[PDB]
Design a protein around this ligand. Structure first.
Ligand SMILES: Nc1ncnc2c1ncn2[C@@H]1O[C@H](COP(=O)(O)OP(=O)(O)OP(O)(O)=S)[C@@H](O)[C@H]1O
Ligand SMILES: Nc1ncnc2c1ncn2[C@@H]1O[C@H](COP(=O)(O)OP(=O)(O)OP(O)(O)=S)[C@@H](O)[C@H]1O
Ligand SMILES: C[C@H]1[C@H](OC(=O)CCC(=O)O)O[C@@H]2O[C@@]3(C)CC[C@H]4[C@H](C)CC[C@@H]1[C@@]24OO3
Lengths: 304, 305
C-alpha cells in the first residue's frame, strides 16, 4: 500500500545502495520500485571492483516506461550515493513531477558527499545545495555534509541545531545529523547524532522538536550504513510521522543490532587479533532480519 | 552460511527474475549474490516497457571482479530466463569453474524456453540448454513443453512423463520437477498436475528414484514470474530437505498457492467487481506474503509413487 521509488546502486555481492535499502523496506512491509544506478561486483572499498554505471538518460527511460503504463505513482522517493550531476538533476526532475502529481509525497535524500574529505566531485555540492535539498522532505547528512550544505562549520550542539534550522529553511522539515564530532557524555567510545523535525501548526507557525542520541561506536569501517539508516528511518517515520524520537530510536537500535552482529561475525571469520577485511565486514543483513522488523530498544533519545 | 549466486532479470516495478527470487531466498536465510541480467521498467505483459540488457562480457567482468577479490565462493547457482546463447554459455563456464572449486555446488536451473504451443526463446538456445546447461545442472524445473523439448519426446501420459524425466536425469540433474502439465487430474479440470523425481544414492552405493505427483488448484489469471519464485523456493526447501523431495515440493507449492491466492484476491479488489485484473494489478504480492513464504502451511500433499 506504501510504495517507495528507490534510485540507488546495486552490488552483486554485499549491501550498499539498493541492496541495503530494499530488503529492510520489503521486510517492514513497503513495496519498492528499485532503479539501480550502477551494477558493480562489490563496493569500492574492496581492493578491486568491476561493473558499469547507468546513464542519466537510461534512468529517464525507465521512469518513462513506468509513466506510460501509468504506474509512476509513489508515496516516497529515496536516493543516496551519486557521483554524476546529470543523474542528480534527473532525480530532481522526477521528484518535481511526482510531487506535482501527489501533494503528500515524501522525498528522503541522503546527501552523500564526504566524511570527517570529499569523495564525490566538488561540482555536486551546488546541485545538492540549490536543487536537491530544496525538494527534499527528510535528509540524513553527517556533520561534514551539513556544514558543506549550510556554509557554516559546527563547533557545538547549539551551532549544530542552528545549522539544522538553516537546512530546514532550505526545504526539509526533518533533518537528522547521523554522525558528529561533538563530545558524548559517556566517553570517547560513544557518538552523537542529533535530530530536528519542524512540524506545522494549523497556523503558519513552526514548532521544531529537537532530539539528541548517543550510540556506541563499533570499531570498524562499514559501507552501506547510511543507505540502511535512511531506509529504516523512512519506514519508522512513516509509522511515527509526528514522533521523531521514537522513529530514530527504532532506526538506531536496528543499526546497532546489525552492526554488532556484523562485527562479531567479521572477527570470527578473520583470525583472533586480525583486522577484518572489507569482504569480511559486509553487513549481516539476512541474519538481522528480525532485528530490522522489531528491534529491541538499546538507545534512548533525549527530547530537548 | 549458504550463499546463492542468482543470475537473472531485474525489473524496476514488479516481481520477475531476481526480484521474485532474492526476497524469498533472503527471507529464508540465504545470502544472495545477485547479477541482474537486464534492467527493465516492468515485464513484457504491460502495454509498454523500457530497459537495458547486460552483455555476456559484462557478466564475465562482474564474475571476474568477484574472483579477483577471492569471494567467488558459493553453495548454489540459480538461473532462469535468458535469451542470448553467449550469456548462457558464460553461465555454464562459471558453473564449471565453481564446481571445480567446490564439488558440492548445486546448480538450480529453470530452462525457460516456452509454454503451452509457444517458444518464447531463440531456437539457438535449445541445443545449448540440452548439450551444455542441463549436463552441469543438479536441479531443473521445466514445464511439460520444456521437458519435451529437452528430451525430444512428446508426453501423452504420466508414465511417459516419468520416462522423459528419467532421460533428463541421465542428461545430468539428479532432481527433476515438471511444474505444469496438460495431464488430467482426478479432482477436476480445474486442477493442475506437477510431477517430481529425485535420484538419491543410498549409502549401499545403489541409487533409488523417488517419484511424486502433486495436484494444485488453478488460479484463474495469468501471472508472471511464477517460475522464478518456484525455483527459488524449491532451492530453499530442497536445501532444508535434501532427501525428501515430497516435503520440499509440498512446502514450495503451498507457498505458491498462498502467494497466488492473495494476489488474485487483491487484484480483483483493485479492479472492479466483474472486471478483468490488469497485468499491473496481478503483480505478485510478495511483500504481503512474507510470512506464508517463511513458514507455509501445507495446503497440498504429494502422492509418493
Ligand atoms: N562504526 C560505527 N559505529 C557506530 N555506528 C555506525 C558506524 N558506522 C556507521 N554507523 C551508523 O551509521 C549511520 C551513518 O552512516 P555512515 O556510514 O556513518 O554515514 P555517514 O558517515 O553519516 O555519512 P552518510 O553516509 O552521508 S549519512 C550512523 O548514524 C550510525 O548509526
Ligand atoms: N495460474 C496458476 N495457478 C496455479 N498455480 C500456478 C499458476 N501459474 C503458476 N502456478 C504455479 O507456478 C508453478 C510454475 O510456474 P510456471 O509459470 O507455471 O512455470 P511455467 O512458466 O509453466 O514453466 P516455467 O516458467 O519455465 S517453470 C506451478 O507449479 C504452479 O504451482
Ligand atoms: C523483450 C525482452 C527483451 O529482449 C530483448 O530486448 C533482447 C535483447 C538481447 O537479449 O539481445 O529483454 C529481456 O530479456 C530477457 C532475457 C530478460 C527478461 C525480459 C524483461 C523482463 C522484459 C523484456 C524482455 C526480456 O526477455 O528475456
Amino acid at each position: 500500500e506504501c510504495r517507495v521509488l528507490s534510485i540507488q546502486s546495486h552490488v552483486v555481492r554485499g549491501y550498499v545502495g539498493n541492496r541495503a535499502a530494499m530488503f529492510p523496506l520489503q521486510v517492514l512491509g513497503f513495496e519498492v520500485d528499485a532503479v539501480n544506478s550502477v551494477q558493480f561486483s562489490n563496493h569500492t572499498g574492496y581492493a578491486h571492483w568491476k561493473g558499469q554505471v547507468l546513464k542519466s538518460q537510461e534512468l529517464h527511460e525507465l521512469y518513462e516506461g513506468l509513466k506510460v503504463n501509468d504506474v509512476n505513482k509513489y508515496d516516497y522517493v529515496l536516493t543516496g550515493y551519486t557521483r554524476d550531476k546529470s543523474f542528480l538533476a534527473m532525480v530532481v526532475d522526477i521528484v518535481r513531477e511526482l510531487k506535482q502529481q501527489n501533494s503528500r509525497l515524501v522525498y528522503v535524500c541522503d546527501p552523500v558527499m564526504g566524511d570527517k574529505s570529499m569523495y564525490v566531485p566538488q561540482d555536486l555540492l551546488p546541485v545538492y545545495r540549490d536543487k536537491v535539498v530544496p525538494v527534499a522532505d527528510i535528509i540524513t547528512p553527517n556533520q561534514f555534509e551539513a556544514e558543506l550544505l549550510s556554509g557554516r562549520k559546527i563547533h557545538s550542539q547549539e551551532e549544530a541545531f542552528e545549522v539544522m534550522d538553516m537546512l530546514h529553511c532550505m526545504g526539509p522539515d526533518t533533518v537528522v545529523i547521523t554522525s558528529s564530532d561533538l563530545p558524548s557524555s559517556q566517553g570517547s567510545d560513544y557518538l552523537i547524532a542529533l535530530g530536528s523535525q519542524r512540524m506545522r501548526k494549523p497556523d503558519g507557525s513552526t514548532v521544531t522538536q529537537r532530539i539528541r542520541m548517543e550510540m556506541r561506536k563499533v570499531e570498524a569501517v562499514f559501507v552501506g550504513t547510511g543507505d540502511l539508516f535512511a531506509a529504516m528511518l523512512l519506514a519508522w517515520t512513516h509509522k511515527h510521522p509526528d514522533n521523531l524520537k521514537v522513529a530514530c530510536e527504532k532506526t538506531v537500535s536496528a543499526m546497532q543490532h546489525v552492526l554488532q552482529r556484523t562485527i562479531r561475525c567479521a572477527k570470527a571469520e578473520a583470525g583472533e587479533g586480525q583486522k577484518p577485511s572489507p569482504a569480511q565486514l559486509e553487513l549481516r543483513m539476512v541474519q538481522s532480519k528480525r532485528d530490522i522488523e522489531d528491534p529491541e530498544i538499546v538507545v534512548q533519545a533525549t527530547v530537548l
